[PDB]
Design a protein around this ligand. Structure first.
Ligand code: AU
Ligand code: AU
Ligand code: AU
Ligand code: AU
Ligand code: AU
Ligand code: AU
Ligand code: AU
Ligand code: AU
Ligand code: AU
Lengths: 55, 55, 55, 55, 55, 55, 55, 55, 55, 55, 55, 55, 55, 55, 55, 55, 55, 55, 55, 55
């Protein structure tokens, strides 16, 4: 139901817009509105399906 | 309930239309409307059933 | 609730009609209408029960 | 909730009537109407309980 | 919710009446009406609790 | 929700009354009415909790 | 939701009253009324939590 | 939803009042009323969390 | 949904007030009212998360 | 749905306010009101996600 | 449904605003309102997906 | 107005149905409904007319 | 008000119809309907007036 | 109209449920409800018809 | 219709609660309410059926 | 229906309160109100069940 | 308005009925109903007027 | 109007029920409901009339 | 009408809940609600009846 | 009805909040609202029960 995004670099954008600096962690749940989440920049994502590394 | 698409190359299309560049990651939930998702180009998909690599 | 079809060859048909080219991946959920899905051609399917290879 | 039938030979019948050729794969969900599914001929079935081989 | 009966010999009866020949496989779900299923003859049954061999 | 009774000998009674011969298999679901099932004679029962052998 | 009692000796009482002879097996579901089950005598009980041996 | 109490000694009290003799087994479900169960004396309890031995 | 408290010493208090002597075991479910349970004295608690030893 | 806090030192505060002494254990469920719990001082917490040690 | 944040350094901010000092632990559930939680500073987070370390 | 039945052996039936084990004693009064009492097995009966020994 | 019939042989009839086997004992009260009781076969009767032996 | 039960051993049950310890004496009258009284364990009963010793 | 209890020792309890000292005698009639009388301690009871000695 | 109390010593109390001196005799009937009679001191009681000597 | 009764021996009666054992202390206030208090046995009473020793 | 009870030993009961451990002090006022207070165990009581020591 | 509690040690609890540190003094009046006050830990209490020292 | 607090040091808090400097004296009466008064810091209190020294 929720994802965990650790921003490994500054200015990481999360759309669905929010900006994160280096070292912050955003835990985001899916609402009715937020049905899709796009991640730019270098970040480390943990979902239910496992982990992944956006660049 | 949701899929994770890491676009390994530029111009990856996701239909159900959105375009992704290299290194971005789209986490997509299934709405009532979006009942099917088609992925073109080279991308790395994680679902509940496991991982797969579209080309 | 959903299946993952990676089309390993061109012109793979999915009925319930859609056509896929080589390398694309279709993630399909079951609606009320779509109660049966038929797959032609060479494709690689992941379901909840495991994987299978249609030819 | 659904079964996966890979038709290993031509003319495989699925009742509940549909016909499959060799190499096709039918993913069938149970509706209210379809409460029983009979499979003739040589086919390879995956259910939640495991796999089986009809002849 | 459903059982898988592979008829290992001809004339296998399934009550709740249907008849199966050798090599066929019947996947049967429980409705409101079908609250009990009786199997005669030599057959190989897979349920959620495991497998069994009726004779 | 359901039990599987393989009658290992003739005349096995199932109350909640039905009679089974040797080699038959009865798959019984619990209705609102059938809240208790008594098994006489030599039979082999599979439930969710495991297997047991009535005599 | 249900328990399995194999009566290992004659006259096993089950309260919530029923009597069992040696070798019988009673599969009992919990209704709204039957909220507690007491077992006397030598019997072998399988529940969801495991097995136990009343004496 | 339910607990299993094997009374290892005579006069075991179960409050929420009932008395058990040595060798009996009480399987108790939680109603709306019975929201707490106290066990005195030497008894052997199986719950969902595991086993324990009251004295 | 419920906790198991074995009182290893006399006068163990359970608030949410009840008192237990040495060797007793209280199995407590959470109602709407009882939303917090405090345990004093030496006791051995089993929850869903595991075991713990209050002093 | 609930957390287990063993207060390893005196005066441990739990906000959402309650105070605990050394050796006590508070098992706290989440109501509608209590949507966040803050723990001060040296305490040992067990949740569903595992254990942790507040200082 | 809930996350566990151990603040490893002083002044850790949790948005969705609260401030934590070193050694405190905040257990936060997701309401309807709190649909996203941002964590600044050095903290140690446990979720259902595992652990992570914000900086 | 009442009879006294000492069950000298196990499984003594009293109709008007109840079962008694060895050593138990049932004191039964005549209601409007219970106008006849039948005793099977080995038992020792005391009535107003004297004593008798059913076998 | 009541009689005690010990059936000393099989098939003893009691009219007012019931059948008794050897060793059974029937204690019969007089209703408004049952104003006369006829006993066939070998039986041993105790009434208020004493004992008698029907053949 | 009433019976006298001297409990010669501990835990004597009287159904119609009450428990007696060794040396206690229960004098029980027959109500409209209590139309049958069953005595377990070792006890010494005095009725109008005489005395008896349950075991 | 009534019983006579001579309390041979102090603190004799009569339930149905009253307390008697040594040497007192309680003559108790059965009301509609008092349908059962339990006697603890050492006492000497005279009923219509005879005498008895509770301990 | 009535008891006879000869007061063998002064100050004998009869509750259900009356006081008797030495040598007096009280013949007491049971009303609806007086359902229990307690006798203190040294007295000699005659009932229907026989005689007794309170002290 | 209130009295203090320390029961120096067992079975001390307080009427207005209650029983006390040795070492207990009853602090009794005067209601509208309790307008007189009688104390039997050996006890030590403190009132507003001073102390006294009942025997 | 109020009493002061210092519990000199563990498990001191105060009826009118509360339990106290060693070293605690309960200051109790008389309500309309609490018209009598009984103290068990070893405790030290101060009233308006002076002090006393329950055992 | 009021009591004076000087907390001689840290964490002194006053129920009727409040916590006091060493050296603080709480002057508490009795409301309608607060009809009983329990004091834990080492504290020095002055009432109208005198002084006392809880531990 | 009233207390006298001489603040022997600066910043003495009186809750029920007011602050006092060194040498000031606050005479406080109990209203309906102010039912409890807490004193921090070094102060010298005179009540009806005597004097005390908060620290
Ligand atoms: Au594009
Ligand atoms: Au065909
Ligand atoms: Au039986
Ligand atoms: Au206690
Ligand atoms: Au801050
Ligand atoms: Au008992
Ligand atoms: Au008198
Ligand atoms: Au007493
Ligand atoms: Au505290």
């Amino acid at each position: 139901d929720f994802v965990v995004i650790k921003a490994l670099e500054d200015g990481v954008n999360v759309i669905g817009s929010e900006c994160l600096d280096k070292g912050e962690v955003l835990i985001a749940q899916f609402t009715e509105h937020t049905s899709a989440i796009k991640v730019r920049g270098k970040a480390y994502i943990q979902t239910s399906h496992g982990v992944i590394e956006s660049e």
